[PDB]
Design an enzyme around this catalytic site. Structure first.
Site, PDB file in Angstrom:
ATOM      1  N   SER A  71      29.705   3.865 113.209  1.00  0.00           N
ATOM      2  CA  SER A  71      28.409   3.903 113.907  1.00  0.00           C
ATOM      3  C   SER A  71      27.544   5.057 113.373  1.00  0.00           C
ATOM      4  O   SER A  71      28.056   6.007 112.776  1.00  0.00           O
ATOM      5  CB  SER A  71      28.592   4.048 115.428  1.00  0.00           C
ATOM      6  N   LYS A 124      26.375  -4.411 107.791  1.00  0.00           N
ATOM      7  CA  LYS A 124      25.644  -3.411 108.560  1.00  0.00           C
ATOM      8  C   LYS A 124      24.486  -4.032 109.304  1.00  0.00           C
ATOM      9  O   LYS A 124      23.562  -4.596 108.672  1.00  0.00           O
ATOM     10  CB  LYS A 124      25.128  -2.287 107.669  1.00  0.00           C
ATOM     11  N   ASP A 136      24.949   5.614  99.010  1.00  0.00           N
ATOM     12  CA  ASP A 136      24.104   6.433  99.862  1.00  0.00           C
ATOM     13  C   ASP A 136      23.940   5.662 101.180  1.00  0.00           C
ATOM     14  O   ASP A 136      24.014   4.414 101.179  1.00  0.00           O
ATOM     15  CB  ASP A 136      22.753   6.659  99.189  1.00  0.00           C
TER      16      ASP A 136
HETATM   17  C1  LIG Z   1      33.021   3.553 107.764  1.00  0.00           C
HETATM   18  C2  LIG Z   1      34.065   2.919 106.846  1.00  0.00           C
HETATM   19  N1  LIG Z   1      33.646   2.249 105.763  1.00  0.00           N
HETATM   20  C3  LIG Z   1      34.512   1.679 104.916  1.00  0.00           C
HETATM   21  N2  LIG Z   1      34.057   1.013 103.843  1.00  0.00           N
HETATM   22  C4  LIG Z   1      32.771   0.738 103.619  1.00  0.00           C
HETATM   23  N3  LIG Z   1      32.358  -0.007 102.588  1.00  0.00           N
HETATM   24  C5  LIG Z   1      31.021  -0.185 102.521  1.00  0.00           C
HETATM   25  C6  LIG Z   1      30.341   0.412 103.508  1.00  0.00           C
HETATM   26  C7  LIG Z   1      28.840   0.426 103.725  1.00  0.00           C
HETATM   27  O1  LIG Z   1      28.402   1.148 104.615  1.00  0.00           O
HETATM   28  N4  LIG Z   1      28.088  -0.354 102.927  1.00  0.00           N
HETATM   29  C8  LIG Z   1      26.750  -0.310 103.032  1.00  0.00           C
HETATM   30  C9  LIG Z   1      26.052   0.769 102.466  1.00  0.00           C
HETATM   31  C10 LIG Z   1      26.755   1.901 101.693  1.00  0.00           C
HETATM   32  C11 LIG Z   1      24.661   0.806 102.576  1.00  0.00           C
HETATM   33  C12 LIG Z   1      23.959  -0.200 103.236  1.00  0.00           C
HETATM   34  C13 LIG Z   1      24.656  -1.265 103.805  1.00  0.00           C
HETATM   35  C14 LIG Z   1      26.039  -1.306 103.703  1.00  0.00           C
HETATM   36 CL1  LIG Z   1      26.869  -2.644 104.405  1.00  0.00          CL
HETATM   37  S1  LIG Z   1      31.401   1.251 104.539  1.00  0.00           S
HETATM   38  C15 LIG Z   1      35.891   1.803 105.163  1.00  0.00           C
HETATM   39  C16 LIG Z   1      36.314   2.507 106.306  1.00  0.00           C
HETATM   40  N5  LIG Z   1      37.690   2.683 106.643  1.00  0.00           N
HETATM   41  C17 LIG Z   1      38.037   3.501 107.853  1.00  0.00           C
HETATM   42  C18 LIG Z   1      39.497   4.028 107.798  1.00  0.00           C
HETATM   43  N6  LIG Z   1      40.508   2.983 107.436  1.00  0.00           N
HETATM   44  C19 LIG Z   1      41.429   2.658 108.558  1.00  0.00           C
HETATM   45  C20 LIG Z   1      42.594   3.674 108.604  1.00  0.00           C
HETATM   46  O2  LIG Z   1      43.769   3.113 109.248  1.00  0.00           O
HETATM   47  C21 LIG Z   1      40.001   1.761 106.754  1.00  0.00           C
HETATM   48  C22 LIG Z   1      38.791   2.074 105.839  1.00  0.00           C
HETATM   49  N7  LIG Z   1      35.376   3.044 107.109  1.00  0.00           N
END
Ligand SMILES: Cc1nc(Nc2ncc(C(=O)Nc3c(C)cccc3Cl)s2)cc(N2CCN(CCO)CC2)n1
Ligand SMILES: CCCCCCCCO[C@@H]1O[C@H](CO)[C@@H](O)[C@H](O)[C@H]1O
Length: 333
Positions: free
Chosen positions: A29, A48, A163
């Site tokens: 979030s 997102k 970013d």
């Molecule tokens: C918050 C989060 N992001 C993860 N991967 C992401 N990939 C892409 C994302 C994203 O923000 N893309 C994006 C961007 C960059 C800009 C505009 C629009 C978009 Cl859509 S965020 C993995 C994750 N994990 C938490 C910890 N683990 C569990 C432990 O047991 C599993 C892994 N947590």
């Protein structure tokens, strides 16, 4: 034409998404992000939902900016847009924006784990960063906030630029210089590279002024040639009153490191942003001998940033955003 959408409550709002995206699972979030499975492509994705995307002129412009930027980035070492959608069937109903990327599984905090990386592994990680930076810089874009948490990696060590948050920041940003050039990101890369080779933060400043203190102990106080380029009366006078420190010999700072790595670090962490190595130049450096390929280090299409000067109404940013949603073309699978 229009996919079929389903509704589901997720972090206390009603998300509405195409059927292709299954098993949404909140992970963060501005906007909340869920991990999901894209049945059309067999990809794990991040979806997102933008928060309050058109609540004010500023929100709307920010929405439009983010969409424009993500739509432009088409490169293996930069995060791209797999999809963008809205449940809205017309401009008149347009209130929601969802952005979709690859689900990245980790960042460079998770990979370093504060233990040293091998020199071969640093070569591959830094190469990819610089390859992505070349692309970004060629579009006349400066990242400005490169750091391990903005660098995402998969299990094959394939890296994408996305970013304390002051540790990787160029000294001229710490000073509010305002005429930043692209080598601010090169400074950031040197700081990251140092850390990967040593397992320790290069400049872990405790507060703002402490950050600059540690920086100057490594790279010396401004030389005569740098001092000529400082227009600020207050800065010149303060700088002239410091005990002059010698630039340290990086070879006697990074002990037992590949001397090519050291040479590259010297070229990145020059106080004078005008004398820092560029991303394209860094890729040609012998440290990257086994990765460098002039045939495959591509540049970007021109990026039209003129919207940034404009002061438009909420409904105008909204309609421009809606045009971008409608024009979106998915990347080749
Ligand atoms: C918050 C989060 N992001 C993860 N991967 C992401 N990939 C892409 C994302 C994203 O923000 N893309 C994006 C961007 C960059 C800009 C505009 C629009 C978009 Cl859509 S965020 C993995 C994750 N994990 C938490 C910890 N683990 C569990 C432990 O047991 C599993 C892994 N947590
Ligand atoms: C007390 C700490 C001194 C920091 C010196 C800052 C060196 C930055 O380098 C300077 O970057 C400016 C901003 O882009 C450029 O306009 C100047 O030409 C360049 O020399």
């Amino acid at each position: 034409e229009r996919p079929t959408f389903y509704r589901q409550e997720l972090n206390k709002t009603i998300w509405e998404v195409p059927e292709r995206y299954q098993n949404l699972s909140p992970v963060g979030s501005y906007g909340s992000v869920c991990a999901a499975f894209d049945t059309k492509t067999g990809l794990r994705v991040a979806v997102k939902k933008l928060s309050r995307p058109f609540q004010s002129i500023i929100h709307a412009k920010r929405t439009y900016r983010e969409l424009r930027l993500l739509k432009h980035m088409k490169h293996e070492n930069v995060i791209g847009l797999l999809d963008v959608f809205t449940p809205a069937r017309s401009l008149e109903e347009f209130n929601d924006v969802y952005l979709v990327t690859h689900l990245m599984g980790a960042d460079l905090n998770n990979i370093v784990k504060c233990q040293k990386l091998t020199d071969d592994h640093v070569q591959f990680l830094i190469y990819q960063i610089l390859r992505g930076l070349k692309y970004i810089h060629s579009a006349d874009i400066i990242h400005r906030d490169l750091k391990p948490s903005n660098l995402a990696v998969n299990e094959d060590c394939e890296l994408k630029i996305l970013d304390a948050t002051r540790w990787y920041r160029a000294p001229e940003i710490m000073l509010n210089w305002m005429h930043y050039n692209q080598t601010v990101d090169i400074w950031s890369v040197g700081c990251i590279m140092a850390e990967l080779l040593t397992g320790r933060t290069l400049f872990p400043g405790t507060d703002h002024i402490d950050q600059l203190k540690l920086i100057l102990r490594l790279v010396g106080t401004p030389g005569a040639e740098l001092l000529k380029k400082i227009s600020s009366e207050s800065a010149r006078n303060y700088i002239q009153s410091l005990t002059q420190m010698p630039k340290m010999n990086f070879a006697n700072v990074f002990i037992g490191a590949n001397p090519l790595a050291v040479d590259l670090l010297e070229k990145m962490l020059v106080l004078d942003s005008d004398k820092r190595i560029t991303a394209a130049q860094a890729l040609a450096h012998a440290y990257f001998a086994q990765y460098h390929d002039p045939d495959d280090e591509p540049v970007a299409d021109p990026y039209d940033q003129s919207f940034e000067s404009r002061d438009l109404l909420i409904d105008e940013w909204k309609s421009l955003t809606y045009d971008e949603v409608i024009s979106f073309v998915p990347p080749p699978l």
